[PDB]
Every structure is written in C-alpha cells, then in structure tokens.
Design a protein around this nucleic acid. Sequence first.
DNA 1: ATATGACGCT
DNA 2: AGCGTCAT
Length: 430
Amino acid sequence: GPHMATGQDRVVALVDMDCFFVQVEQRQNPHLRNKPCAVVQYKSWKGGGIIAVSYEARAFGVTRSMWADDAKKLCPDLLLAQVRESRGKANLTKYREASVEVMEIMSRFAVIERASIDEAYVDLTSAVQERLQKLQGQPISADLLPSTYIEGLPQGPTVQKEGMRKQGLFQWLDSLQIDNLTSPDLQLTVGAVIVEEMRAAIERETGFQCSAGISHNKVLAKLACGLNKPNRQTLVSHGSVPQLFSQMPIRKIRSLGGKLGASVIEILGIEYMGELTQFTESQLQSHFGEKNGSWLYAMCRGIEHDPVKPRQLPKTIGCSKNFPGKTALATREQVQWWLLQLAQELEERLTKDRNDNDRVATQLVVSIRVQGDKRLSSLRRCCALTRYDAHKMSHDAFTVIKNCNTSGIQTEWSPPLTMLFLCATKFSAS
DNA sequence: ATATGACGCT
DNA sequence: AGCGTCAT
Ligand SMILES: Nc1nc2c(ncn2[C@H]2C[C@H](O)[C@@H](COP(=O)(O)NP(=O)(O)OP(=O)(O)O)O2)c(=O)[nH]1
Ligand SMILES: [Mg+2]
Ligand SMILES: [Mg+2]
C-alpha cells in the first residue's frame, strides 16, 4: 500500500496533428477545406496510394493504404492532393517543414520529443508545478478546458456528444482537490489546461488542428490522444485505467500491435490489457523476457517509465524508394542512376540540416531489397560519409552493394532490386 | 503493387 | 556491425 508506487510522478502529453498531410494541403488550397479529401503518392498505379484521409472522407470508409481508384468507388466526390515528386520519387519536404512549424510552437511550452512527422511527446511536470504556484489554490474553471474529455466520465446516477463531454468534465472538476498541490489528478488537470493553450497556439499560428492525450506517461498519453479525435483532447487519469483497460484489446497499446502482442494473447490466452494483472512479474518475464515482462507487469497497471527524451530533431536523415513488380531494377546503369537520384535528395536535405541545426552526419547506411524477399530490408551496409556530395555518396553506396549482383553479365543486375534506401546517421556537432 | 524513423538483439 | 520489430 504505502510503498507501492503508482506511476503518477509525471504529467506527459502526446500531441498529434489531425489528418496531417491533408491539413497541410488544405491550408495551401482553400478549395480542399471541409471536403472529403485524401493525400496520395504517385498516380499511375490505380490512382496513387492514399496516405492521409480527411475526417469527411473517412466517413465514407476511405482509409490509409487504399488505392485512390478504389477510394473513389466508396467516395465519388473524394478530392485528392498528390505528394510532390522530385527526381522521380516522392518528396516529403512540404510536410517536414510544416512539422517544424508545429514543433517549434510546442517547444515554447516545454521539452518535447519528436515522435514522428506529426506528433511529439511533452513532459509537462515542471510547467504544471509553475502554473500550480501561479494560481493560489484557485479552482479550475471548465472554461479553461473547452475541448477536453475526461475518460471514464460521466458516470453514476443528455443525448448530445458535447453534452456528455461537459457532464464528465463537471463531475471531474467537482471532485478535484485544489488545495493539494501534489494531487496527481490536479496535476493532470493543470496539464490539460496547458495543452489547451498549446493547441490553441498551434491552430492560431499555423492553421492546423490537433488532438492530444494527457496522462502520467507516454503510453497512456498516446492511447488517450486517439480516444476523441479530431480536434479534441482526452485526460486519462490513473484511476481511469482499470475500467479503460478491462475491455482494451492488447494490440491497441503502443508496441503491442505486432508479434509480441500476438504472443501475449496466444501464450496467455487473454484478450484485454487488464487481464495481464493476474500474472506475476516473474511469470510475464518467463514468457516474454526480463525487460518485456517487467514492462508488461507495470503497464497493465497503467505504469510506465520511458522518459520524454529532449529531442526535437530526427536522429537520421534518409531517402528510399520501392521498385515493385515489373519496375524492379534489373541493370547496373539503372541501379546507379537511382542511387544518384536518392543521393541528390539526401545531399539537399543534409546541407539544409547542417545549416539549420549545426551538425554533420558521419555515416551513410545503404540498404536494398531483392525480388522475392518479403522483409523490409534484404541487406544493410555502411560506409563513411565524409563529404556532402551526391555523386560521391552514390558511388560509395554502389561500391558497398555491387557485390550483391548475382549476374555474370556486365549489363545485368540479378536478382532485381525492389528497394533502394540511403540513410545518413551518426551526427556530430558542427 | 503498401517513405520514412526509432530502437532492441546479438 | 547487421538484422529484426514496431510505428506513423
Ligand atoms: N509516405 C508515407 N506517409 C505516411 C504514412 N503513414 C502516415 N504518413 C503520413 C501521413 C500522415 O498525415 C502523417 C501523420 O500520421 P498519423 O498521425 O498516423 N495519421 P494522420 O495525422 O493523417 O491522421 P490522424 O492522426 O488524425 O488519425 O504521417 C505511410 O505509411 N507512408
Ligand atoms: Mg496525426
Ligand atoms: Mg501521428
């Protein structure tokens, strides 16, 4: 009881842009705003692959990884914006720059960890302490939380969605202990006040809307964030966890969406995250290893200790392209030409990076995929990255993979290459 | 015929 | 180092 830690030590948020690439294209082109809209890359094969979908288009069943031609069957009036294409490949620069807009705003409030192109974790523990002293045990008004849901509420003894939201919020606020600066629920609440402010600033200054989760750790914040998308934020308290997890499929928790999660379900014969509480830590460790077992034992209780890393910038800078089916690269001159296209984009991005961020990459990782192999990568090799020069980088990349060629013929490259990937890594200050 | 980026294992 | 996992 009195010595059992409860993982209520931090206030952590996860901010995620709503249909991000779509919002970027909608800001630029007002004709797309408030429409069923999707963002696709390429266009020839079945109209392009969809990678972002507006909430209006989602209502018709349009999803990520759908071909545009297929999406149009679900949604005849679907509007499309295409990813820029440069040097014969998708060029994501517009979205990366839009991401930086958002991240720089977030960074004004607190330490952020860039988690993807459109989301960041925020460690609000300090900011919350500040704001709490700033306040004089002053009650928190529901007016400070106009887009916040409290997960699990309302409960106990309206038919509108906004109605429910306020009911739950009222119940939450009516029960808060505002004179105890160390109440975790109070700290979460103040955290949510700050995230309202953050989300307001992002929208005012960029035009982009986002959702957020506020809880005591990254996993719960990320889970919370998805509970009430779009344009809303969700507070998941420590106390909400038993009911929330009691029907929560294991695959919904970050890192359990793949094979480990499947084995948890398979080996233990369970479905829901809460069902994990019935196993001892040693049991879980026996099945899934020391780290995973410990992590699971704590997580199913709502406890997780992964820190918000102070890192706003990506650690690697890479470019890749798939060459599916018949388009697989079959000749030496083909492989070289595409390595060059990749290396030229990489040079551009690295030079920009060196100027903006005062660092230089020192290692170049070269990765390929051969026809027949259904892995992400067939093979990875590194070499020194000593100069930001596309021709040198592409020549080096070729050198470290040219032995993979099975062909005896000068011209030919067998087996044909279905993917090329160049990645700059191991940065140093500059 | 579905462009990236972080991290763990050995 | 090079491979595998998980993710957006
Ligand atoms: N090239 C490529 N881009 C992708 C992929 N997946 C996502 N992107 C891009 C496109 C996404 O816009 C962006 C953010 O990824 P999310 O946060 O998972 N989804 P979104 O923000 O669209 O909607 P919401 O969060 O409201 O559910 O990352 C992919 O598989 N490939
Ligand atoms: Mg998003
Ligand atoms: Mg995201």
